[PDB]
Design a protein around this nucleic acid. Structure first.
Ligand SMILES: Cc1cn([C@H]2C[C@H](O)[C@@H](COP(=O)(O)OP(=O)(O)OP(=O)(O)O)O2)c(=O)[nH]c1=O
Ligand SMILES: [Ca+2]
Ligand SMILES: [Ca+2]
Ligand SMILES: [Ca+2]
Ligand SMILES: [Ca+2]
Ligand SMILES: [Ca+2]
Length: 901
DNA sequence: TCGATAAGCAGTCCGCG
DNA sequence: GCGGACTGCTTAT
């Protein structure tokens, strides 16, 4: 097999590399790598190395990496550019793996672990590590085993061995319900003392050294705790055995308001799953506790136990260990669904970076571009310092707030990367500038044509047309990957809808789910078989289809994020290729493209309708337009349609056969006007929206920019079994909105769009009547909590204290003198509830850690004093008033002359 | 929260005769 | 009461 790296590090003048050799074995080597860097040289000096601008360079080969680094410093002292890849391990990988890396995941040791630490005096600080580690569960992907290290004797209590038999039993049998599918994969090791546990853990680690190390909060808690605890008991040298090269570093992570420490383990790639989830999931969650996320992702119930976690080991060691094991498994289950480890491996090996560098789009692109240029013997420029400067972004149209009955939307494919490719925007393709007119002059095609030679953006930039820049070349490769995965995602989605339709008529039989590839549209044969399947088999196929869609989503949306990240990186001062001329060339072109096509679409539809100056485009944001289709429907007449699907088909046909060719013509003209390299503005129909045929539903409404709701029948070619609400920006979509209120507001919107005013009024009256029965957590607002200390003046709110911070201060006074009470953590999220006048907490609100029940000794008081009236007005009535006033609708029935009867 | 801009709403402070 | 200036937070793209 072809060899591939596992990890790479620079330690002084050595590269330490772990890799898989040609026989599939894991090996380690130390290489005295001699790096090369570059200086510009005279034209008269023959060379094969040229910088990205075609200027000749001489290669300087250094005796060692320290010499190269020192040379860079002296070049800065002299005032001359030191060219080349200054991150020597990236150059090492580029030299050692000079081919497309083919990796085998089955050879990569992926470790998932979780520790338990009993602490009687609050949160066990990892930097102090003053309490015994009393459980470790460590799952190894190569062995496919859960290794459980269980401390039986502690200063906080001596316990009996954990029982695998009780663990397996149902909770209704007094068991822990450790899933049957992992029971046979548990290797249980009890220990008489903590020293023996840790020494054995280190020996085990030495034998089965993680390449990828993950878990939940492992980077911020488990790893620093283990390192520091071992350091405290045994000394530094023993603690450093967590690194295969025996090198570690305390790394200070700084943010806007403070800093924290993590432990860098040289020769390991830590991908904390909480951070993978935050980067790759495109959710914003009210809580990031593993129980919360597990419930959300997997629909598994919260791990239930009695009493505080600090007393769980002594009271119920059996459950304590079982829950530690289950916690490790839950992360594996989330990964089986979301496939973020797979994604990280894919991207990391593609870029030829340390796998953990996938968190950095700048590092990822630096390596991709470096490797690409190196293939041509080209030499990358030195990174430079730049002052942070604001720059303009997208255009967003101001909508007229209203109901909008029939709506068809259109959206440009991968806009910013398509602009880069079309215009040919790259550091080395800049050709010069032209004299800019106001943007509206380009939008209306009245400005002078920018160039007859070069490809242009309306920000004034011109670009070469003779050859693709490296940025366009490399962005295209990843775009093509993204496109393939999006195809699989949408097929799985369409396949899901076929199964949903079939589920209306399940067969009374005993059968099996069909063995099918959900990434491809179901054949006629598969469709016929599906229509004969039981509900049991259909539901299993639906689950599998949806899992396939999720896998496709992960792969596509994050490749989209990477390519959009390249466009963004051009506006980040830390990027080697930072250039506001290029960043603004993209964003300004986008503003033109949107408003240009708004004009073209209005012109086309006014022509087909025989009108003049009417606005068919009601809204647009960045690269999308929303077109009022009322007049199109009315031209045939609603009476002519058999059912909802009939007019959806009609609009689908109209969009594809009439509107898209008109849009294409408009963009081809724009390409000519800007003299671009290649026409790549591809705007396709996205949504078809409207009320159900014959209903009083309003179809859709806008309240303002980035705030709208549509009743969608078809999305990008997926024809839904049931209409789907596309709600953007409204409170139903905000993690800050109480859970039960999101739900209520969504139903109000559903009724508005699908059923009409009277239905909305019926629901509102009921919610208002019953909402005080809702669980307090379900009606609590959510907020991130920053700068608690800034606004804390002797335990009371300082000037300008935010509402949620005031709530935290209230909580802090209420729990004062309790080392056991859950502390609000700076930077994390809180639930917030308003309090009625004259409450014993002495303020108008209280807040506590999100994803948790408020502590028992104040819970009863919070419940008694919760201000339901304020809660309803602020979170429910105010947003609903916004929706209905925009839609020109009343949520309460207005008095009429009929009331006389 | 270590790892592009536009723009919405909640809330504080305080003016607005 | 509402709005503008400002902070804080959370979206859409
Ligand atoms: C979502 C997103 C978009 N954008 C910019 C770049 C996008 O090209 C542009 C439009 O966003 P989208 O329409 O969401 O995405 P897209 O056009 O890139 O891809 P597609 O429609 O094919 O799924 O907005 C960002 O800069 N960062 C982001 O995170
Ligand atoms: Ca735990
Ligand atoms: Ca788009
Ligand atoms: Ca599309
Ligand atoms: Ca059937
Ligand atoms: Ca879009």
């Amino acid at each position: 097999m072809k060899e591939f790296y596992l990890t790479v590090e620079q330690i002084g003048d050595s590269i330490f590399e772990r890799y898989i050799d040609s026989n599939g074995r894991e090996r380690t080597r130390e290489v005295e790598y001699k790096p090369s860097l570059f200086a510009h040289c005279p034209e008269s000096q023959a060379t094969k190395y040229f910088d990205i601008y075609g200027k000749p360079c001489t290669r300087k080969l250094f005796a060692n990496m320290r010499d190269a680094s020192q040379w860079i410093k002296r070049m800065e002292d002299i005032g001359l550019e030191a060219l080349g890849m200054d991150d020597f391990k990236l150059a090492y990988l580029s030299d050692t793996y000079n081919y497309e890396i083919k990796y085998d995941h089955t050879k990569i040791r992926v470790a998932n672990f979780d520790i338990e630490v009993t602490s009687p005096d609050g949160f066990p600080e990892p930097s102090q590590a003053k309490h015994p580690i009393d459980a470790i569960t460590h799952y190894d992907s190569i062995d496919d085993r859960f290794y459980v290290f269980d401390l039986l004797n502690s200063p906080y209590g001596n316990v009996e061995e954990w029982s695998i038999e009780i663990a397996a039993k149902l909770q209704e049998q007094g068991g822990d319900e450790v899933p049957s599918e992992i029971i046979d994969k548990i290797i249980y090791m009890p220990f008489d003392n903590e020293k023996e546990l840790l020494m054995e853990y280190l020996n085990f680690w030495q034998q089965k050294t993680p390449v990828i190390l993950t878990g939940w909060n492992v980077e911020s808690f488990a790893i620093p705790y283990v390192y520091n605890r071992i350091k405290n008991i045994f000394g530094e040298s023993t603690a450093k055995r967590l690194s295969p090269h025996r090198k570690t570093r305390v790394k200070v992570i700084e943010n806007m308001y403070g800093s924290r420490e993590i432990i860098t383990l040289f020769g390991i790639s830590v991908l904390d799953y909480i951070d993978l989830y935050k980067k790759f999931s495109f959710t914003n969650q009210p809580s990031y506790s593993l129980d919360y996320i597990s419930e959300f992702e997997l629909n598994v119930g919260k791990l239930k136990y009695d009493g505080p976690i600090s007393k769980l080991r002594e009271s119920n060691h059996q459950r304590y260990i079982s829950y530690n094991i289950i916690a490790v498994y839950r992360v594996l289950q989330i990964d089986a669904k979301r496939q973020f480890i797979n994604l990280s491996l894919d991207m990391g090996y593609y870029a030829k970076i340390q796998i953990q560098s996938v968190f950095s789009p700048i590092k990822t692109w630096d390596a991709i571009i470096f490797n690409s240029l190196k293939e041509q013997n080209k030499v990358i420029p030195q990174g430079r310092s730049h002052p942070v400067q604001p720059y303009p972004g997208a255009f967003v149209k101001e909508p007229i707030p209203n109901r909008y009955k029939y709506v068809m939307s259109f959206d440009l494919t991968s806009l910013y990367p398509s602009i880069i490719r079309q215009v040919n925007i790259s550091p080395e393709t800049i050709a010069g500038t032209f004299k800019v007119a106001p943007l509206h002059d380009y939008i209306n095609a009245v400005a002078e044509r920018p160039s007859d030679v070069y490809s242009c953006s309306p920000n004034g930039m011109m670009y070469y047309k003779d050859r693709d820049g490296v940025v366009p070349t490399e962005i295209t490769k990843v775009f093509n990957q993204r496109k393939e995965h999006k195809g699989y995602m949408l097929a799985a989605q369409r396949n899901g809808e076929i199964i949903k339709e079939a589920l209306h008529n399940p067969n009374l039989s005993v059968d099996e789910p069909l063995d099918v590839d959900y990434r491809f549209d179901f054949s006629d044969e598969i469709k016929e078989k599906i229509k004969k399947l039981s509900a049991k088999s259909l539901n299993e196929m639906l689950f599998r289809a949806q899992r396939t869609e999720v896998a496709g989503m992960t792969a596509q949306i994050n490749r989209k994020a990477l390519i959009n990240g390249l466009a963004g990186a051009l506006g980040n001062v830390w990027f080697r290729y930072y250039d506001l001329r290029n960043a603004t060339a993209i964003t300004t072109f986008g503003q033109m493209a949107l408003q240009w096509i708004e004009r073209k679409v209005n012109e086309y539809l006014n022509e087909v309708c025989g009108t003049e100056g009417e606005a068919f485009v009601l809204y647009g944001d960045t690269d999308s337009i929303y077109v009022s289709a009322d007049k199109i429907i009315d031209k045939v007449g609603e009476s002519k349609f058999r059912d909802t699907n009939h007019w959806v088909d009609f609009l689908d046909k109209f969009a594809r056969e009439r509107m898209e060719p008109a849009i294409d013509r408009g963009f081809r003209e724009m390409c000519e006007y800007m003299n671009n390299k290649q026409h790549l503005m591809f705007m396709d129909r996205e949504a078809i929206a409207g009320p159900p045929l014959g209903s009083k539903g309003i179809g859709g409404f806008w309240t303002g920019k980035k705030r709208y709701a549509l009743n969608v029948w078809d999305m990008e070619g997926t024809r839904y079994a049931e209409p789907k609400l596309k709600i953007m920006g409204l409170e139903t979509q905000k993690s800050s909105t109480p859970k039960a209120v999101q739900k209520a507001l969504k139903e109000c919107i559903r009724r508005m769009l699908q059923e009409g005013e009277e239905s909305l009024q019926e629901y509102f009256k009921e919610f208002e009547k019953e909402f005080r029965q809702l669980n307090y957590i379900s009606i609590a607002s959510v907020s991130s909590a920053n700068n608690i200390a800034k606004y804390d003046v002797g335990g009371f709110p300082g000037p300008k204290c935010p509402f949620h911070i005031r709530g935290i201060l209230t909580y802090n006074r209420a729990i004062k003198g309790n080392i056991d009470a859950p502390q609000v953590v700076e930077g994390e999220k809180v639930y917030v509830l308003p309090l009625r006048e004259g409450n014993p907490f002495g303020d108008k609100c209280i807040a506590w850690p999100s994803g948790t029940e408020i502590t028992d000794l104040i819970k009863d008081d919070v419940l008694h004093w919760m201000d339901y009236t304020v809660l309803l007005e602020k979170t429910f009535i105010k947003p609903l008033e916004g929706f209905t006033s925009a839609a020109k609708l009343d949520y309460e029935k207005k008095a009429s002359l009929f009331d006389m009867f």
